[PDB]
């Protein structure tokens, strides 16, 4: 198990423009295109991201390429983020994945807002952090995914992703 398989399970794979859980135009493996309600704006963003006239549809190779770029960016983002880097650096390799997962889904800014949870993770107070992370819009809106990520932070193992 690794970050790519983890996110592939949480985000799925779709080759045509779709709306994510919040209603935003997305494609591939959770690649957000735009928050604008315009499917045209979305189609424009897609072509620009892929470098060709896609008309709203891409190939698996293209999907995997975007996914790779996105994970890469997420990690680099964490590493240059003042509030996130120290936490990331304090964690083991499995837990690094749970943090990347959150950033991939909500963005740096979103994650940087979990101040108290972050301090608890830094202090390695696993159960306390898990309870705190659950007190959030994130948990209430996407509970199954949040439960998987939280369990990952709590246990430091891939159990929540086993049998999926
Ligand atoms: Cl969910």
From Swiss-Prot:
Record Pfam families: Phage_lysozyme
CDD domains, per database record: T4-like_lys
Catalysis performed (reactions): Hydrolysis of (1->4)-beta-linkages between N-acetylmuramic acid and N-acetyl-D-glucosamine residues in a peptidoglycan and between N-acetyl-D-glucosamine residues in chitodextrins
Phenotype for residue 20 to E/Q: Loss of 99% of enzymatic activity
EC number annotated for this UniProt entry: 3.2.1.17
One GO molecular-function entry: lysozyme activity
One biological process term in Gene Ontology: defense response to bacterium
Positions of the catalytic residues: 11, 20
Keywords (A to Z) from UniProt: Antimicrobial, Bacteriolytic enzyme, Cytolysis, Glycosidase, Host cell lysis by virus, Host cytoplasm, Hydrolase, Viral release from host cell
Main location: host cell
Compartments reported by the entry: Host cytoplasm
Effect seen on changing residue 30 to F: Almost complete loss of enzymatic activity. The enzyme is destabilized by 1.5 kcal/mol
Enzyme superclass (EC): hydrolase
Effect of residue 117 to V: 50-fold decrease in enzymatic activity
Activity across pH: Optimum pH is 7.3.
TM annotation in the entry: none
Residues at which substrate binds: 32, 104, 117, 132
GO cellular component annotations of the record: host cell cytoplasm
Keyword Hydrolase: yes
Function per UniProt: Endolysin with lysozyme activity that degrades host peptidoglycans and participates with the holin and spanin proteins in the sequential events which lead to the programmed host cell lysis releasing the mature viral particles. Once the holin has permeabilized the host cell membrane, the endolysin can reach the periplasm and break down the peptidoglycan layer.
Homology family: Belongs to the glycosyl hydrolase 24 family.
Name of the featured protein: Endolysin
Organism: Enterobacteria phage T4
